């Protein structure tokens, strides 16, 4: 049913342990390869979306499909309705409320700013846009992979992030 560009994965005689998920250790599964592909087979960098990029994309898609339904003619509790099916509406309502309960970047402008500033592994890249962290300690212990890369810059990046973080 639900399939993707991941195709054969044919059987070599030696089997492997790498199917074990552990997000502390950059093991995600053979569906989120470090270099993705598209539906035209062209190579493309992996996507790992923070809550901000995701919130913008979902709001945009729902209002776009509503504009499509209306012939060309505002709130998540309403904006999730665009789907088809009661389970669909419920799931998307929970997702949108989850996004609007934790979206520190509540606009496309600051999302663009963080996009420029950030562009490094997309996992921690998005988790920084998702996880407010005071100093180096919270980041390097909750995300243990920033240690063995010797390009941290967490101090100032997090400072400017929490500075750009809107009130609540």
């Amino acid at each position: 049913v639900s399939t993707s560009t991941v195709g054969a994965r044919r059987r070599r005689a030696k089997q492997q342990v790498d199917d074990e998920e552990n997000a502390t250790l950059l093991r995600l599964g053979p569906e989120f390869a470090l270099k993705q592909y598209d539906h035209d087979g062209n190579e493309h960098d992996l996507i790992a979306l923070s809550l901000s990029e995701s919130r913008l994309l979902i709001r945009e898609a729902l209002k776009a499909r509503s504009r499509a339904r209306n012939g060309g003619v505002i709130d998540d509790d309403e904006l999730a309705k665009v789907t088809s099916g009661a389970v669909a509406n419920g799931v998307v309502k929970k997702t949108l409320d989850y996004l609007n309960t934790f979206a520190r970047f509540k606009d496309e402008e600051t999302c663009t700013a963080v996009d420029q500033l950030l562009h490094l592994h997309p996992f921690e890249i998005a988790q920084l846009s998702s996880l407010g962290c005071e100093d180096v300690d919270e980041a390097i212990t909750l995300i243990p992979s920033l240690a063995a890369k010797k390009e941290v810059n967490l101090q100032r990046i997090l400072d400017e992030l929490n500075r750009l973080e809107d009130p609540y």
């Binding site: 195709g7 054969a8 044919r10 059987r11």
Partner: protein
Amino acid sequence: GGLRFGEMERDCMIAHGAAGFLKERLMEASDAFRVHVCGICGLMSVIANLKKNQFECRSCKNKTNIYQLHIPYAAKLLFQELMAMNIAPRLYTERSG
């Protein structure tokens, strides 16, 4: 009984270019069957329970990449005899190289 649509009849159908008629003679007018193959190992060792909607190739520990194929019952029997003599006819539904 039925009449034999032998090899020379197949030659005449091939000369005529009637591929659909040949497939219909050899399948729907004869031993047509449906088997499940493992999408990973390509052996007909898949355990299908159709009323419980559950499938499994135990050897590969697989339950999701399984396909159905319509093939002659004589072809299934041929592959099982080949397996009986330690050959693995692996039926793959997509080309790699």
